[PDB]
Design a protein around this ligand. Structure first.
Ligand SMILES: CC[C@H](C)[C@H](N)C(=O)O
Ligand SMILES: CC[C@H](C)[C@H](N)C(=O)O
Ligand SMILES: [Fe+2]
Ligand SMILES: [Fe+2]
Ligand SMILES: [Fe+2]
Ligand SMILES: [Fe+2]
Lengths: 261, 268
């Protein structure tokens, strides 16, 4: 009564989706955040702090709206009869959300704090934002929380995706493609923040959030297209990926702009 | 700018909740399903299959609508800033209902099938429904999926709670308290199903779903009434607390009628 598309139609949805991500210029060699993170010689505490505050809000919104999007899919499946292949892909989304919410993967539980302190936006706030905030004034702290326009547009697409039954599939499909390059970028950026000529992040353990993400993405991610049940949902999927990818690309370009200002 | 109630009003609200589950006659001694499961001497394959099909549908809806309610709470936390106490109670919801969906807890992970075969309504369907189904008629299998009225009222309340930010807290707070007694009743009832002299579930392996739940539901019941990270920890003002009690009283009642409907099918 409710099945994925045959594997041939799905494979072409995957090729259309990867071409969407190419066209959005989200690849390692294309996007201005990755290039700036390699290129800049140093990063000021104020610039690093501001990017860290933006990322905190973006990662918080990614986690909660992806879960909300799984909620929307669950409302449908409560009354329909999803077959096992659909149920397996639904499970994958649940477990991938669980990394950011509860450090389900052993790569994260080995290093993350326990309880709510380990939620990834909170863990980022405690170990990346806070030491940077020690080195910016109160004025700059308030200014950093006035999010730039491309960041607000991304957050708003995420709220729209929180209601879609395909929304958690779109978000995970784009973010898990770019997560590794984002985390490596962060490792390069925060390795270059100096205050008074000394590194703000001087101890290895201070990078634990970032090093854990780099390792989890190097190793790991029933794919996301396994949640598409017909042809016209497939069109909807590709259309939503193109939009969401574009907004991620523009948000990441704002990080690169802030590091080269 | 979003916090739980102080400890005293929270523990107060926990008392009214437990009194509503009392008044709804859901304790091991007050509900007719628990009585009848211990008291009946034998159960026919058709009656045991009917209850099994009903429970399949109820636990399917329970899982998916509690997940949907967690999504509705997540949508609100994406807009506001919840303090860490709220986020701890939120994690509990994700952890508890995540056992029905993927068997993370150790009691389930050792015995549950892997992948979608382990989703609890699927695992129930494969190991309880399907063996009973071999012993009833096609007409019996059709009739059993026409759910009784008290079961249909319960599902309709679940669908409403799927879109409430407190819905997952309501459903978990009630279902996780009575879950152990239901699993004990299932162990008694399906040990008593005879198909022409033969018991349909003779081997211990056949009770894997129920045995794991007898073990596991003791932890879950403690998880949802914990004073720091329990379900009332999701209530953020006094009026949300009243809406909570209102919704629990309703929800606990419909669970009673549906369960009493299980007992009647086993008796006369
Ligand atoms: C947007 C999510 C990224 C890739 C990472 N999972 C994090 O916790 O920030
Ligand atoms: C209603 C919940 C029960 C006790 C069990 N968790 C199940 O999967 O059916
Ligand atoms: Fe993460
Ligand atoms: Fe991730
Ligand atoms: Fe269960
Ligand atoms: Fe449970």
């Amino acid at each position: 009564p409710l099945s994925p598309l045959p594997a041939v139609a799905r494979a072409e949805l995957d090729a259309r989706t990867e071409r969407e991500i190419d066209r959005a210029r989200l690849r390692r060699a294309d996007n201005g955040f990755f290039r700036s993170a390699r290129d800049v010689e140093s990063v000021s505490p104020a610039d690093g702090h501001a990017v860290a505050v933006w990322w905190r809000q973006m990662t918080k919104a990614f986690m909660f709206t992806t879960l909300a999007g799984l909620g929307a899919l669950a409302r449908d499946y409560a009354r329909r009869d999803a077959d096992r292949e659909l149920l397996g892909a639904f499970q994958t989304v649940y477990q991938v959300i669980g990394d950011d919410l509860d450090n389900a993967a052993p790569e994260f539980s080995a290093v993350a704090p326990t309880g709510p302190a380990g939620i990834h936006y909170v863990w980022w706030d405690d170990t990346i934002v806070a030491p940077l905030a020690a080195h910016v004034t109160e004025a700059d702290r308030r200014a950093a929380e006035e999010l730039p326009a491309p960041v607000r547009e991304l957050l708003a697409a995420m709220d729209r995706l929180a209601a879609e039954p395909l929304g958690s599939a779109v978000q995970l499909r784009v973010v898990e493609t770019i997560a590794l390059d984002i985390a490596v970028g962060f490792r390069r950026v925060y390795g270059k923040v100096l205050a008074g000529g000394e590194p703000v992040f001087g101890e290895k353990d201070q990078f634990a959030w970032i090093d854990a993400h780099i390792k989890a993405e190097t190793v790991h991610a029933t794919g996301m297209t396994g949640l598409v049940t017909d042809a016209e949902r497939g069109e909807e999927f590709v259309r939503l990926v193109e939009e969401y990818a574009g907004l991620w690309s523009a948000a990441l370009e704002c990080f690169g702009d802030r590091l080269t200002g």
